[PDB]
Enzyme design. Structure first.
Site, PDB file in Angstrom:
ATOM      1  NE  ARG A 222      -3.563   0.220   2.545  1.00  0.00           N
ATOM      2  CZ  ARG A 222      -4.149  -0.404   3.548  1.00  0.00           C
ATOM      3  NH1 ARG A 222      -3.764  -0.199   4.794  1.00  0.00           N
ATOM      4  NH2 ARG A 222      -5.157  -1.232   3.295  1.00  0.00           N
TER       5      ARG A 222
ATOM      6  CG  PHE B  27      -1.459  10.649   3.057  1.00  0.00           C
ATOM      7  CD1 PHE B  27      -1.853  11.458   4.125  1.00  0.00           C
ATOM      8  CD2 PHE B  27      -2.053  10.856   1.800  1.00  0.00           C
ATOM      9  CE1 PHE B  27      -2.868  12.476   3.956  1.00  0.00           C
ATOM     10  CE2 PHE B  27      -3.048  11.862   1.640  1.00  0.00           C
ATOM     11  CZ  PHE B  27      -3.435  12.666   2.724  1.00  0.00           C
TER      12      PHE B  27
ATOM     13  CD  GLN C  20      -0.208  -0.484   5.845  1.00  0.00           C
ATOM     14  OE1 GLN C  20      -0.756   0.618   5.739  1.00  0.00           O
ATOM     15  NE2 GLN C  20      -0.806  -1.549   6.441  1.00  0.00           N
TER      16      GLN C  20
ATOM     17  CG  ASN D 161      -2.915  -0.371  14.948  1.00  0.00           C
ATOM     18  OD1 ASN D 161      -4.099  -0.070  14.652  1.00  0.00           O
ATOM     19  ND2 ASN D 161      -2.103   0.469  15.587  1.00  0.00           N
TER      20      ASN D 161
ATOM     21  CG  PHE E 223       2.673   3.591   8.554  1.00  0.00           C
ATOM     22  CD1 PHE E 223       2.235   2.927   9.732  1.00  0.00           C
ATOM     23  CD2 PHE E 223       2.700   4.977   8.535  1.00  0.00           C
ATOM     24  CE1 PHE E 223       1.845   3.639  10.883  1.00  0.00           C
ATOM     25  CE2 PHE E 223       2.292   5.735   9.673  1.00  0.00           C
ATOM     26  CZ  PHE E 223       1.843   5.097  10.863  1.00  0.00           C
TER      27      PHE E 223
ATOM     28  CG  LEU F 270      -2.026   8.172  11.512  1.00  0.00           C
ATOM     29  CD1 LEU F 270      -1.073   7.555  10.469  1.00  0.00           C
ATOM     30  CD2 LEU F 270      -3.320   7.309  11.531  1.00  0.00           C
TER      31      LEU F 270
ATOM     32  CG  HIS G 135      -0.920   3.787  13.764  1.00  0.00           C
ATOM     33  ND1 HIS G 135      -1.113   2.581  13.113  1.00  0.00           N
ATOM     34  CD2 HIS G 135      -2.093   4.466  13.653  1.00  0.00           C
ATOM     35  CE1 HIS G 135      -2.332   2.537  12.610  1.00  0.00           C
ATOM     36  NE2 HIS G 135      -2.952   3.674  12.900  1.00  0.00           N
TER      37      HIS G 135
END
Ligand code: ZNI
Ligand code: ZNI
Ligand code: GDP
Ligand code: GDP
Ligand code: MG
Ligand code: MG
Lengths: 163, 168, 169, 163
Positions: A54, A59, A62, A101, A112, A121, A125
């Protein structure tokens, strides 16, 4: 002293470059050791050969699902999942290395790398590392991402280990 | 959060829109001809010191579907109008592309940039002069590019973002 | 040409939005959990002897992004509002979704279907009549489904198409 | 006499099923013969092993690029390209087999199978056959398409020949 690990990135099998990471064992030793051991393969399993499934430009990138290679899997060296260690460190900017997660206390192996500050986040995370060398490799990986994260080429960890 | 900008690339087929878009996005040159259905791309960049996210819609220039071209024309904020400097037909098609965009948006001045591409070729049929005189009439920038050598790619789209910013 | 219907699948994550969608599109059951960012699918189907094209948007329920739901709700033509029959909180979330679709579309009359998914499971916490009474008070149909057994999967998406036609006249 | 050819279709290597086609040699002999011969491979090259690179549900499945395997290639038994033989036959509904092209008189090997009427292609693409058996398999191939035609699994002609 904080360990350092590296990924050699490939794109459809063709070398892209090396990115290395400092892991903040001084602040999150459990989460740092998981990532270290998965990078070396020393438990008999790990990141080598897995993909960045991903990639969302603007951003993050991942990866880390080495058990299913479809974005749903991965496992830690402690069991399939383990608890959130702490949220001391924040997602302050590009290069932050942080755990993926599926809610509280579900860390496995997916992780990531931020390519921007992702402040929302924080507290959700666990941040445990940051890019040391090769941030331009992570930037170059964004060229193969999309709005929903689907990649247009196979982005692999062709090799990885501890420095 | 960084600001996002939704750009739309248009032109007759074969001129190099996808090769320009792919050069902007992936710094790679496609020498093979792969005519477009519809593709979207995202890239973060810094323009005049401000980080932003480009959301780019690459479109097909088939005339059968010119009706549905209206829809993305609603959503797009700026338009890279591409012709090829060895294809007079694609140059004449530009006027038609401008007319329709001005229709669907219902304005005289839409953020917009004319692009003469393939300027590496030893052949030329559209003089620089013609495309300058056309661009000047419309009141928009003109840039010659080459996806093959990557000349002028970044300028085209940033200028376009800078035309969106100036009218935004 | 065949008419296109823009359907949007919404609800709390974990209820089976994606499993229902993948059953419709591909006719198999995703057992694994792949929480959605955003995905779009296309399928032609015959509904009442009329072939049409379904355009399905499968959405994220993540609460951190609730205020970004607006653009897809503006473009969607009808909405499958999904909860899981073993998760009372996902049923309670339904109100918040319907309210938001009305508030974003600024209309009390939006094509929707209430879907109670996971009806293969034994550990039910939301009564069928409890979901039926709710659907009745909204003025929308209610369908129990199982993405695992395929029970009601076509019925849910076809009934939403039928609601869009009714709203369109 | 109109010959019949078949494709055995696979999905990520998994057999899906067989689609057979009637080829309209009695209206477009040159175009029928090209597809016939590429389906047998009798000239040293053809469809066996190639993929369906574009599947758009509600409209059509397209393949035939066995020289580049990326949607831009292909070639006929007559050389690079050949002329539009005629436009007698129309895109009247599901099952129509027609030639892809990049403008007039650019037929090579790429083809498409309609899953709906596509009458705006009439007079621009040469229709030359129709699905005889296995329409349900063409329908199942739409499970793996998307709005812009990118496929979500690798759809291949694992075998093909003449019946
Ligand atoms: C609403 C759209 N949308 C966005 C988003 C949002 C925003 N705004 C802009 C404005 N800003 C405010 C001023 C601050 C806020 C953000 C813009 N545009 C977008 C995107 C591009 O619009 C399509 C996102 C996002 C994220 C999710 C769902 C939808 C999302 C989502 C699904 S699952 C998850 N997130 C956590 C996921 N879990 C798993 O993968 C589990 C799998 C199973 O168990 C192991 C494994 C996980 O851990 N990570 C690791 C961390 C980054 C995270 N993925 C991820 O990908 O975030 C994507 C993204 C783009 C950062 C956020
Ligand atoms: C506007 C979007 N859009 C649509 C379309 C249109 C409509 N309608 C139009 C008709 N209305 C009727 C009056 C009511 C209703 C609304 C709805 N939704 C869509 C799609 C799903 O929105 C994304 C299309 C379509 C087609 C093209 C580009 C854009 C398109 C396009 C590009 S190149 C080509 N077409 C010919 C191509 N050439 C090559 O591939 C060359 C490569 C190099 O050299 C060998 C090889 C070729 O031969 N074929 C073989 C034949 C089918 C054809 N591809 C193809 O894929 O058509 C796709 C599609 C969906 C059938 C049409
Ligand atoms: N010589 C040259 N060829 C180009 C250039 N840009 C594109 N092409 C070629 O032109 C053909 C059409 O390019 P493409 O990007 O698909 O054009 P599009 O249909 O407008 O998207 C391809 O063979 C390209 O490699 C350029 O700047 N110079
Ligand atoms: N038993 C059962 N499990 C389901 C059903 N639908 C989804 N699941 C499971 O519930 C979890 C979440 O499914 P998903 O489709 O990802 O939910 P989403 O977040 O709403 O998209 C996955 O483990 C699915 O396998 C169902 O009808 N029955
Ligand atoms: Mg193109
Ligand atoms: Mg989902």
């Amino acid at each position: 002293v904080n360990p350092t690990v590296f990924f050699d990135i490939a794109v459809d099998g063709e070398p892209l470059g090396r990115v290395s990471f400092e892991l903040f064992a001084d602040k999150v030793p459990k989460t740092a050791e998981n990532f270290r051991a998965l990078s070396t393969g020393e438990k008999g399993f790990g990141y080598k050969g897995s993909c960045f499934h991903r990639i969302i430009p603007g951003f993050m990138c991942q990866g880390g699902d080495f058990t299913r290679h479809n974005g749903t899997g991965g496992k830690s060296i402690y069991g399939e999942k383990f608890e959130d260690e702490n949220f001391i460190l924040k997602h302050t900017g590009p290069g932050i290395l942080s755990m993926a997660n599926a809610g509280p206390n579900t860390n496995g192996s997916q992780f990531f790398i931020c390519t921007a500050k992702t402040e929302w986040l924080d507290g959700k995370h666990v941040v445990f590392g940051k890019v040391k060398e090769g941030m331009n490799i992570v930037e170059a990986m964004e060229r193969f991402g999309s709005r929903n994260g689907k990649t247009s080429k196979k982005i692999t960890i062709a090799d990885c280990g501890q420095l | 959060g960084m600001t996002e900008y939704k750009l739309v690339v248009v032109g007759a087929d074969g001129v190099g829109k996808s090769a320009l878009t792919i050069q902007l996005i992936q710094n790679h040159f496609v020498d093979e001809y792969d005519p477009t259905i519809e593709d979207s791309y995202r890239k973060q960049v810094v323009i005049d010191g401000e980080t932003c996210l480009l959301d780019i819609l690459d479109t097909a220039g088939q005339e059968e579907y010119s009706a549905m071209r209206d829809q993305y024309m609603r959503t797009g904020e700026g338009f890279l109008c591409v012709f090829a400097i060895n294809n007079t037909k694609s140059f004449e098609d530009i006027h038609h592309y401008r007319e329709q965009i001005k229709r669907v948006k219902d304005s005289e001045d839409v953020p917009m940039v004319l692009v003469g591409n393939k300027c590496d070729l030893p052949s030329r049929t559209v003089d620089t002069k013609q495309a300058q005189d056309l661009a000047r009439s419309y009141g928009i920038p003109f840039i010659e590019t080459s996806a093959k050598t990557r000349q002028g790619v970044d300028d085209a789209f940033y200028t376009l973002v800078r035309e969106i910013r100036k009218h935004k």
